[PDB]
Each structure stands twice: as C-alpha cells, then as structure tokens.
Structure 1
C-alpha cells in the first residue's frame, strides 16, 4: 500500500538546519508531491480518534 499523508500529532523532533529558504514559492509550485498547507486556525493538532 502506498504511504499517504496524515496530519496527526506526532511528537515531532527538533532539528538544527533551517529549511525556510525558498518555501512559500516552492511547495506552491510543485517542489514535491504530498505537501500540505495550514493557515492560522488550521495549524493545530487534530482531534485524535481510533
């Protein structure tokens, strides 16, 4: 089965390198597949359920 995206609250990990250089242009213009935007109120942790 092909791996697809989910927005579930994984306890993410704290890297070192920046990533912000050329982003707002990039994933809006096809840098890769399975990107996901969030805009303010949507940038939160989803209601977990199972």
Structure 2
C-alpha cells in the first residue's frame, strides 16, 4: 500500500523557519511528489466526514 495524500483538516503546527521560497517554480517542475494545488476560493478546511 502506497501512502497517499489526503485533505483532512489536521491540527497543523507552525515551524519557525519558512518554506515559501522557490515553491512556485517547484510546482511546474517536480521537486517533490504528493502535492495538490488549492486556489483561494477553495483553500480551506473541508467538511469532516467518516
């Protein structure tokens, strides 16, 4: 079983160091796998279901 991505509203933690530099390039050419874009009208916590 390959571990996948999921959009479930985790209680995320904040790190002191930043992440945001060179991310916009890295979506076009894959620096890292398991990514999914979200635009601002739909970038939120999804409704939890089970």
Task: Tell me if TM exceeds 0.5.
Answer: yes
TM-score scaled to structure 2, two decimals? Answer: 0.88
SS at match of 1:19: coil
Structure-2 separation of matches of 1:24 and 1:41: 19
TM-score scaled to structure 1, two decimals? Answer: 0.88
- Long gaps (5+) in structure 1: none
Over the aligned positions, Cα root-mean-square deviation in angstroms equals 0.9
- Is 1:2 the counterpart of 2:7 in the alignment? no
Range with bigger deviation, 7-16 or 21-30:
21-30
Shift of 1:27: 2.3
**Count, aligned residues:** 50
Q: 4+ residue stretches of structure 1 with deviation over 4 A?
A: none
SS at match of 2:22: coil
- Per-residue CA deviation, residues 7-48 of structure 1 (Å, 9 max, x unaligned), is 110000011101111001112211111111101111001111
The structure with the greater share of residues assigned to strand is 1
